[PDB]
Design a protein around this nucleic acid. Sequence first.
DNA 1: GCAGATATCACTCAGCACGA
DNA 2: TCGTGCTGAGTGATATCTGCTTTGGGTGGGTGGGTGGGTTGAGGCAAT
Lengths: 92, 82, 137, 124
Amino acid sequence: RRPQVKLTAEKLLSDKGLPYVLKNAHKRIRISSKKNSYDNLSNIIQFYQLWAHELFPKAKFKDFMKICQTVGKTDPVLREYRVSLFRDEMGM
Amino acid sequence: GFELSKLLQKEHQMRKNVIKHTSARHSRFGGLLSIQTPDKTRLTVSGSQALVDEKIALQKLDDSKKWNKRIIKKHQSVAAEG
Amino acid sequence: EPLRIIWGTNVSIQECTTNFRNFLMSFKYKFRKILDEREEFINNTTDEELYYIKQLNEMRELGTSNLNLDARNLLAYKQTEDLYHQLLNYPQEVISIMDQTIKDCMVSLIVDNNLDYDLDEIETKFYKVRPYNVGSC
Amino acid sequence: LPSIQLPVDYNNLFNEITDFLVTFKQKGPKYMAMLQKVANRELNSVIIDLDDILQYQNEKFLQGTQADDLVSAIQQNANHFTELFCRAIDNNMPLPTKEIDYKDDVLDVILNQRRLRNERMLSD
DNA sequence: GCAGATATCACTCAGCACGA
DNA sequence: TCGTGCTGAGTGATATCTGCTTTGGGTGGGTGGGTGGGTTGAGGCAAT
């Protein structure tokens, strides 16, 4: 009767998602030599889990990562953009 | 005896680590936490232990989710192939 | 940096924890006497000593997991005036925070003092606070 | 559910009630002052005197602008006019004049956060 | 008319082999 | 070296279904009602 919510390229490419990550990802995340490795890993996973929950509350963190892997493998439009970001850096 | 003592010492360490996640008060004591994300929105997480440690709060928020992605494991017993 | 906040209010839990830890760390009974207009009754031995530090040390020596608390003592101190109202209005969250802060204070006292006490006994013990004298009956 | 044509109109009665709470004068209007006290958290009970309603009705009729008999309507079916009076008070409620605490108001933080979230969601 | 325990059917997804 | 159409498999939501009492007893009541029923006997203690 109702199509299942699914992590499509459209949601990822929306303002919330990859654009949000590129906007503010280095400022919030911070790996410090003084702090232990566990704390830095916790901080990184803390940022990414919050972003995923804001974007895709449906799936847990590990499931979100696996779905992201599959989508990146499949979707061509996602590949287009992923190549594009790298291309801009080569330009820079 | 020595092996039993070592195993008991390992189990005691595991129990000590587990105790860190349990609340001093009983289950029905109550207490709701409201953790605000940077985009001015707050999510409610219950439990006494979630109030002090943020990692526990995030972990409980993770576990509360119900939907699970598929995992298919097709395995054949040895008796099937003799 | 998500900010922990008690539901339905605007009190930061980290503020509560740090204020309670400071109050426990540095509290002298002379403040209680000053509050009750009993300044002239202040001695120089009992009222010049860290009350709750002795309470926690006695707890450890006797192996107990209970610390009775007086709200009027919270009112006496400077940093914990709002903590009294918070405890009165939101007892569950404040009580849990106080219990965890008491456990943290005991652990820090043992570690910093460089005592020979084994950390296992304190680590696996549940600590609870029992406030009383919280106002009119 | 067959329908009947009862000789009672609720829009007109609600308009009359709204006019009653803003025009009656047993000092400004009595019930306006009573509500003003409530908005300051000084009163938690508003008592509507049907004698006042009768006096207002007779005053209006004397002027020639006869209106519906509100007193008889209230007694014949009272469980419905509680809602009407509450709605009228909510509509005509005045803004507080004395500074309120607003500190330990669970159903003010809840509502503020609910408004912020709704505005952010709708705007996006 | 209403809540709970139970079983039915339909739809969609990850693996597989082949052909490009 | 690899891309995609076909398939079996398994949940999700939804269809029918049974059940909607139940129960002996006064801290479940009598505005829940008798077509839902409840039928002691000895022993201890106050009053006298």
